[PDB]
Design a protein. Structure first.
Length: 302
C-alpha cells in the first residue's frame, strides 16, 4: 500500500548528461550516439539574450568553439547544426552508455520525470506534468538548462522535454528534443505570458481512485451526476472539460474499485463546491492533478 509521487529510475539518463560550454556560456547537454543536444542559447552572452538573432550569432561560431565534456573525457565536435531551438553537436565518439531511446512530443496533462543537472552532473530527480498552458512547475536554478524530461517503457527511454528558461512568474518553459517549444514561448529574455492554467480533471479523478484503493474513501458521496452537469461545475472552477475519452481511460480504474466514473465525478463536484472541511486525501489538503491514470496503475500494480 501507500501512494507517493514517484519518478522513473534515472540511471539510463544519467549516462547521457554532458557539460556543454561555448565561449563564456555553459549549460547541460544530452549525448546520444554521436550527437549532443543542448539549448541553442549556449551561444549567447548575457547581452545577446535580450534580442538574439540566433542565425547570425551561430555564423560567428566554428566547431572548435564548442567544448563538450563528459566527466573528464573531452569530446571533439566535428559538426554543428541548429534545429529550431536546440543545437546539434556532432562528435567523433558515440556514447557507449546510449540506451534505447525515442523522441516524443507529449500532450498537456501527461507526466514525465525530470533529471536536474548542473555542469553535466545529475543532482536530483523529480516528477511533474505538462500544465494545460504548456508550462511546468519544477526546480531549476541557474545552469540547469539542458536538463531533460523523460519516461521509461521497460528498456526504452522516451525523451520529451529540455529546459530552456524560467518565466518571470516562477514557472518553467522548454522544448521537445526536436527543438520546438511547448506553448507560445521564445528563447529570449523578455516578458512572456503563460496564460490561464486550468486543472487536469482526468488526473484528479485518477488520484481520487488511488485514494479509494488506499483506504481513503470519505469523499465517496451518495449523489451521482451527468457529464454535462459536472462539466458546468468544472468551468466555474477552471477545470479541463471531461470527455468520454477521459472516461474510457479511467475504465480499468473503475473496474478495479467498482465505482462508476460518473459517481466519482459527483464526489469531485461536492469537493469543489464544499471544499475539504480541513480533512486530507492521501495526506494532501488540496486536489492533486499531476497523476495520470497510467501513473496510478503503475503504482497500484508495480
Amino acid at each position: 500500500s501507500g501512494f507517493r509521487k514517484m519518478a522513473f529510475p534515472s540511471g539510463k539518463v544519467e549516462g547521457c548528461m554532458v557539460q556543454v560550454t561555448c565561449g563564456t556560456t555553459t549549460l547541460n547537454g544530452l549525448w546520444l550516439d554521436d550527437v549532443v543536444y543542448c539549448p541553442r542559447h549556449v551561444i549567447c552572452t548575457s547581452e545577446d539574450m535580450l534580442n538574439p538573432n540566433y542565425e547570425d550569432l551561430l555564423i560567428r561560431k566554428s566547431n572548435h568553439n564548442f567544448l563538450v565534456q563528459a566527466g573528464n573525457v573531452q569530446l571533439r565536435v566535428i559538426g554543428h547544426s541548429m534545429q529550431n531551438c536546440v543545437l546539434k553537436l556532432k562528435v567523433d565518439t558515440a556514447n557507449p552508455k546510449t540506451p534505447k531511446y525515442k523522441f516524443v512530443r507529449i500532450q498537456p496533462g501527461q507526466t514525465f520525470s525530470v533529471l536536474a543537472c548542473y555542469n553535466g552532473s545529475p543532482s536530483g530527480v523529480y516528477q511533474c506534468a505538462m500544465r494545460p498552458n504548456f508550462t511546468i512547475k519544477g526546480s531549476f536554478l541557474n545552469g540547469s538548462c539542458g536538463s531533460v524530461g523523460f519516461n521509461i517503457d521497460y528498456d526504452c527511454v522516451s525523451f520529451c522535454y529540455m529546459h530552456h528558461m524560467e518565466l518571470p512568474t516562477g514557472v518553467h518553459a522548454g522544448t521537445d528534443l526536436e527543438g520546438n517549444f511547448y506553448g507560445p514561448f521564445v528563447d529570449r529574455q523578455t516578458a512572456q505570458a503563460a496564460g490561464t492554467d486550468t486543472t487536469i480533471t482526468v488526473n484528479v479523478l485518477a488520484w481520487l481512485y488511488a485514494a479509494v484503493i488506499n483506504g481513503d474513501r470519505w469523499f465517496l458521496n451518495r449523489f451521482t451526476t451527468t457529464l454535462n452537469d459536472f462539466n458546468l461545475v468544472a468551468m466555474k472552477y477552471n477545470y479541463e472539460p471531461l470527455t468520454q475519452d477521459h472516461v474510457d481511460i479511467l475504465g480499468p480504474l473503475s473496474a478495479q474499485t467498482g465505482i462508476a466514473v460518473l459517481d466519482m465525478c459527483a464526489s469531485l463536484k461536492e469537493l469543489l463546491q464544499n471544499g475539504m472541511n480541513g480533512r486530507t486525501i492521501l495526506g494532501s489538503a488540496l486536489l492533486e492533478d499531476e497523476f495520470t491514470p497510467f501513473d496510478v496503475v503503475r503504482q497500484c500494480s508495480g
